Amino acid sequence: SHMASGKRGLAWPWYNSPLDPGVLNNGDGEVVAIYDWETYAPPTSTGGTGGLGFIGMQGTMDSDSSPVAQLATRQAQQGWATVFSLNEPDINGITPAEAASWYIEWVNPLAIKKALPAVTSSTTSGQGLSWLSEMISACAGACYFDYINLHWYGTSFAEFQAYIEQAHNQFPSYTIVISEFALTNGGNQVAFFESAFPFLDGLSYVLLYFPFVATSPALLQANDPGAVTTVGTGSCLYTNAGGPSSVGNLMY
Template sequence: MKVSITAFVALALASSSLATPSVKRHGPGKRGLVWPWYNGGLDPGRLNDGQGTVNLIYDYETSAPSSSNGNGGLAFIGMQRCTDCISSPISQLAARQQQLGFTTVFTLNEPDLNGISPQQAADWYKQHINPLAIKKALPAVTSSQNAGQGLDWVQQMVNACSGGCFYDYINIHWYGQSFAQFQSHVNDAHARFPNKKIVVTEFALQNPPGGQADQINFFRQGFAFLDSASFVEMYFPFLATSPSLFQSNDRNGSLFVGTGSTLYNNDGSISAVGQLLLQA
C-alpha cells in the first residue's frame, strides 16, 4: 500500500504519543496557595502551570483574593475565619458563596488560641455553616499539644456538636522543628479522626537556622508525604507571598516562621520553594 510521507509522519507521531502517555503529577487536587490580604501586587497565576500541579487558593476571607490576576485560574476556597467580622460578615456568607461559587468553605482560624470555646464554636457552626450545601471543614487549629488546644480542642468541639455538625474535613496547622514532628502530627490527626479527610492549611518549619535551604529540605519531604497520604485532601505551605511583604505587613508572623518559606521573591518571581511546589 502506498503511503505519503506526510501520512507516515503523522502516523508515527500518533503511535509515539500512544506509546508514551504523559506522566500524571502527584499534586492535582491537593496543592494550594495561602494568600494574605496584602498580596495585591502579586500574581497567583504564576503558580498555575496549566497542568493542575497547584490548583487551589484561599485568603482567610469569603471575598475574592486581592491580586494582580484575581484567583489566577485557581479554585477559590472561601474561609469564614471569624464568627463575624467586617471583612467577612457572617450575614454575607451564603450570598458570597453563591456569588463566587466556591464549593468548599473553611471556618474559624485558630479558635483554640483565640478564646472561642468548643461549645461556642459548635453552636455557631450549627447555625451558620451547616446550612451551606457544600464541602465544609471544622475550624483550623494549631499544632499545640496543650490540653484544650490543637486536636484536643477539635475533639471537644466534635463532642459538643453531639452529632449535629456536618463536616467533611479536619483542618490543621503545623509549625515545628522537623519533618518527623510534622509527619507524626498529621498521622495523629488521622488516627484521632480516621473517618474524615485531613486538610493542612498552614505548615512550615518554625524559623529554622538554615532559612530557605532548611525549608526546602523540609517541604521536599513534606510534599511527598502528603501526596502519598490518601487521607490528606489538600495542603497549603505557608506562605504565598514575598519576604518583603511578609515582613512589612506581618512582622510577628515573619519573626515566628522566618521568610525562607515564602513562595515568591521580592521581585514577584517564583522562589525556590515555589518552584518546588510546582514539581511533581
Template structure:
C-alpha cells in the same frame, strides 16, 4: 532660712521618688508562650496576630516561643485558659518594619519542570494577596484567603477557591458573599484555640457552625472542619466542639495547621489526626519548618531539607488531599523566611515556590 528651704526640697524629692515607685510596671510583650500565635495579615481580613522579629545572626532569638505539637508541657483544653499574660500580641508597624525577608530567585530553576496550570496536584495556595500577582502562580487547583472572598482571577486561572468564615467577625461578609454557586466547598473557624486568632470556646464554635456553616450543605457545598493550631490543646478543642455540636456539625475534609522543626514531628502530627478521623481527607492549610518552642532555630539548610523531604512524603499519603505551605506572601511576619515561597520584591515564585509548583 536657707537651711530650712534646703531640707524642705530634700523632703519633697523623697516624697516624689516614693510616689513614682508605684507607677505602672513595663509589660513584657513576649512573656507568655501560651498566647503567642502566628501572623494573619489583618489588613487583608484575617487577624494580624504577632509582632515580627528580626532575623538576627543568633537564630535562637529570631522566633517567638509558641507551644506546638511536640510541646507536651502544654495541656490546656480551652482558649480561655491558654493565656496567662496580661500583654497583647498584635502586628504593629513599629515592630514589623524591622523584619526584612531575604531575597530569593524569581525565576524557575532550569531543572524544574513546571506545569502551566490546572494540574490538580496537592500543592495549594494559602493566599493573602488578592488578585495581585496571582497569574504568576497558575498551576494549583485550590486556594483559600483566610476570608470569605476569592480573587476574581482565580476561576480564569483554573484555581478553585474555598471561602472561609474565619470567625465571628466575618459573619456579615460571609453571609453576603457565600451564595449557591459561589464555590462548592467552604472552610470555617481559624485557630479557635488561640487567643490571637478566632479565639472561641468549643460551644461558641458549635453555635457559629450550626448557624452559618452547616446550612451550606443544602446549597451544594462540602465543608472543611475548623482548624486549630498545633498547640496540644487544639486536638482537645475539636473533640469538645464535636461534643457541643451534638451531631449538628458535619464536615467532609479535616484541616490541620502545623509549625515545628522536624519531619518526624510532622509525620506524627498528621498520623495522630488521621488515626482519630480515618474516614476524612486531610487539608494541611498551614505549615512551616520553624521552632516556636524555644531554643535553636533550624538553619536555612535544614529548612530546605525539610521541604525537600516533606514534599514526596505528603505526596505519598493518599488521605492528604491538599497541602498549603505557609509562604506564598511577601512578608512572613515571624515565620522564618527560608520557608517563603514568594520573591519578596516581585511577588513571583522563588526557588522553593517553583519546587512546590512542580507538584502540579
C-alpha cells in the same frame, strides 16, 4: 508523573494585590486551590485566581472584612465548592461549645463541602486535636462537615510526619486539609518542603495542603511582623519581584 497528585494550594494573603497566583500554577495540575483567610475574592494583580479554585473562609466569628451575615451571600455570588471556618479557635478563647453553636448557625447552611475550624498542633490542655474532638462532641451530631483542618509549625520534618500520622491515627475516618504548615524560624524551609511534598502527595486521606505562605518576604515583613518573628521569611513562595522562590519552585 503522568497525572498530578493535585493536592497543593496557595495560602494567599489580603496584601497580595501586586502578585499573580498564575505564576505558581503551570497547569500540570499539582496546584488546584487558593484561600485568603476571608470570604472576599483573592486580591491579585490580574483580578483573577490564575485558574485556581477559590475556597471561601469565615476565619473569625464576624469581622468588617468577612461579615458573617454576608457568608451565605458571598458563597452564592462566587460559587465556592468548599468553605473553611474559624482560624485556630483552640488558642483564641473560643470554647468547643461556642464554636459548635456558631458553626451550626452560620456554616451548616452552606450546601457545599465544609471544613471544621483549623486547629493548631498544640497538645497543651484544651488546645489542638483535643479541642477539635471536644467541638465534634459539642456538635452532638448536628454539625455538617466533610473535612478536619490542621495547622502545623515545628522544628523538623520528623515532627511534622509524626503529627500528620498521629492526626490520621486519632481521626481515622476523617479527610484532612492542611491549611497552613512551615518550620518555625532558624531551619532550612526548602529541605523541609522537599521532604513534606512527596510524603503528603502519597496520603489518600490528605485532600489539600497549603504551605505557609504564598507571598514575598517584603510583603510578609510589611504586613505580618508576627509571622516573621515565628516563621521567618524562608517559607515565602514568591521572590520580592513576584517570581517563584526556591520554595515556590517546589509547587510545580
